[PDB]
């Protein structure tokens with residue numbers, strides 16, 4: 006088989022890159038390990054940046070998002086008996102964020118790729134990458150027991166944290182930066198109306214809680230849990246009693262509860278590799294970096310890596326400027342590290358940590374009181390939360 | 400002996416409280432352990448907030464400060480080969496800071512107290528405080544071997560970190576918050592012209608450096624040093640070679656060096672006690688709290704504790720409103736904890752720490768790049784650095 010760009014991974018990064026590229030006339034094949042149905046079972050993200058909303062419109066896949074996505078103009082933080090609204094729109098200079106589930110975005114891209122007839126191979130087993138510093142890279146994989154070869158000019162590793170393409174770079178050429186946090190998030194999806202029209206992040210003595218949503222009749226809630234926990238110990242009953250105990254009383258009284266559609270625990274991690282490319286392999290999304298879910302930045306950083314890679318591959322194919330591709334990692338990493346610092350900051354001030362002496366507990370509380378009480382403080386949260394601007398380039 | 404307010408400590412907190420009170424007609428005695436000359440040997444602070452400048456004018460002791468103090472409109476931070484100016488005046492809404500040495504402020508207050516004839520007992524040995532929850536507190540002390548008693552209505556503990564008055568409160572009534580940092584500052588005073596017209600804080604791989612001043616012909620420099628260091632291992636020569644190595648090359652080339660007038664190491668500490676009062680004893684200044692020198696807040700928090708105590712003692716004596724004194728600690732601690740959080744933040748992003756994994760090193764660098772590159776980021780530094788407004792009260 007032969008193509009121009011081989012994309013490893015059919016989650017949101019690989020599908021959005023594939024759609025952008027197809028629309029500009031650049032042929033591409035996506036290889037995915039799993040089935041369509043397994044990819045669509047993953048709940049994950051709910052919050053999209055405007056930058057991400059504009060990229061879906063650029064890829065022509067925004068009809069359902071513009072109908073069904075909810076635009077949010079603000080977010081609440083609750084701490085020490087008080088609730089504080091951050092007017093994102095006012096403080097960021099008119100930007101907002103959009104709530105539309107990752108499942109939905111992925112289904113829309115999948116429906117779009119299928120219609121235009123572009124290649125996607127699902128159940129592609131044992132993907133291997135070869136001759137990365139050559140002129141002619143190739144990918145081998147197995148389909149129904151026979152080993153096939155796909156020849157390409159470039160490879161985009163969009164295969165998430167446990168994918169083959171970061172593992173295919175000589176470990177000595179990579180610098181890893183990682184922090185593992187001593188807690189996870191227990192998340193619960195329920196077909197119930199959300200308890201507020203905006204998000205509520207809560208710092209409570211028992212641990213963090215977050216109230217979020219998917220639509221007017223579907224809700225998504227999170228509580229901080231130790232790493233030792235397993236989801237079979239948390240009945241629906243136990244989760245709603247614990248959520249209610251971590252919220253302000255006038256918010257817990259209004260809570261409509263109900264059976265879970267989905268329940269799961271996600272560990273919190275920060276992870277960055279430098280560089281994000283090797284020869285003709287370019288990493289994008291969770292393959293190159295992980296942020297804790299607290300700043301809602303993972304899928305949105307995937308969007309700007311993909312946006313930066315699409316514009317540089319377009320310069321390389323339409324305009325013959327293949328040299329501009331060496332700049333991919335420097336351009337992406339400026340943005341990645343600022344969103345990593347915001348996600349770390351949010352995580353630090355909203356969660357209950359283990360080694361906590363009396364001084365750090367009080368500095369944590371005073372960080373919330375300063376940033377939420379000052380107009381300049383509020384603006385640093387708001388501009389980071391809506392998403393810092395993408396780099397123009399050339 | 401009998402007085403209205405007994406003040407333990409003749410450093411800047413006790414002298415400024417004493418002057419304010421004398422000027423409003425409220426009699427007061429200051430007791431100091433040391434001699435005038437020992438108190439005047441301490442170099443310490445160089446940066447005063449406007450709030451502090453206005454309080455010295457209110458106490459009538461500002462003639463030399465208005466002549467000789469330098470008003471600064473901005474400050475520089477240097478990190479990773481670049482220098483960034485924070486325009487304090489622009490970003491704080493017109494506030495500036497004033498550079499006038501602590502030695503000078505203290506001499507001016509001392510000269511003022513002497514002239515007006517108010518009581519000061521120096522070499523007051525073994526000060527003890529008695530009957531703190533009574534109607535009639537008293538202080539005993541020794542002068543030339545004989546033990547004398549001073550009767551008073553109130554006692555102000557302005558005796559710094561190692562003073563008797565925090566030790567005189569039942570330990571069970573106090574909550575202590577403390578962080579000890581794994582480094583100190585080696586400071587050097589030299590009769591040389593400053594290397595810049597504004598302050599330069601420098602984060603360097605070898606450790607922190609700070610370029611500061613006392614006048615057009617006197618300079619004060621600091622380098623971060625391990626706690627194991629002793630000042631006799633640091634010759635003038637060794638200090639200037641190390642200062643130069645931590646600065647941008649175009650700043651080290653312009654440096655005029657010279658012999659030290661004073662050299663000393665100061666350990667970095669954060670410390671807060673809650674409450675700041677017990678019965679008829681009120682703590683003020685370093686007796687109640689310590690901040691690391693990095694945000695220039697210690698003497699300025701002493702000024703606002705004293706300002707808050709003077710206005711409440713005035714309501715108690717002129718207006719009979721002695722009940723308003725129970726509010727002293729709650730009013731002071733709102734301000735103390737925000738300046739403690741700023742001083743901790745400055746310390747964290749400007750110094751080289753020991754346990755430093757690759758992720759934290761990069762978050763430290765990204766904090767500097769975000770706060771210094773964003774207008775909202777720059778405004779949070781600038782409003783904290785000029786001093787957050789004092790509480791109005793009643």
Ligand SMILES: Cc1cc2nc3c(=O)[nH]c(=O)nc-3n(C[C@H](O)[C@H](O)[C@H](O)COP(=O)(O)OP(=O)(O)OC[C@H]3O[C@@H](n4cnc5c(N)ncnc54)[C@H](O)[C@@H]3O)c2cc1C
Pocket residue numbers: 013014015016017018019036037038039044049050051052053107129132163164165166167168169170190192271289290291292298301302303304305306307
């Ligand atoms: C609890 C939670 C909440 C989050 N909330 C948000 C939020 O609100 N906002 C936000 O911006 N981000 C959020 N995120 C992050 C976001 O979901 C991810 O960053 C996003 O899924 C990244 O997409 P991706 O395509 O890079 O990776 P993935 O979604 O992981 O997809 C990669 C694909 O590659 C496939 N693959 C893996 N290995 C191979 C292989 N060897 N061969 C072939 N295919 C392979 C996988 O099967 C997978 O389909 C959240 C994450 C979690 C877990």
Ligand SMILES: Cc1cc2nc3c(=O)[nH]c(=O)nc-3n(C[C@H](O)[C@H](O)[C@H](O)COP(=O)(O)OP(=O)(O)OC[C@H]3O[C@@H](n4cnc5c(N)ncnc54)[C@H](O)[C@@H]3O)c2cc1C
Pocket residue numbers: 407408409410411412413430431432433438443444445446447501523526557558559560561562563564584586665683684685686692695696697698699700701
């Ligand atoms: C290196 C350094 C740099 C600094 N830079 C700045 C800066 O630029 N800006 C800023 O705002 N702050 C800065 N500070 C902090 C500032 O110097 C202090 O917060 C300030 O000295 C507090 O004044 P005070 O009167 O409360 O205490 P002190 O100055 O400590 O004086 C207390 C007095 O009480 C006396 N005393 C103690 N025990 C007894 C007793 N038992 N009986 C009687 N008398 C007693 C002592 O002899 C002393 O004279 C700096 C400090 C250091 C060390």
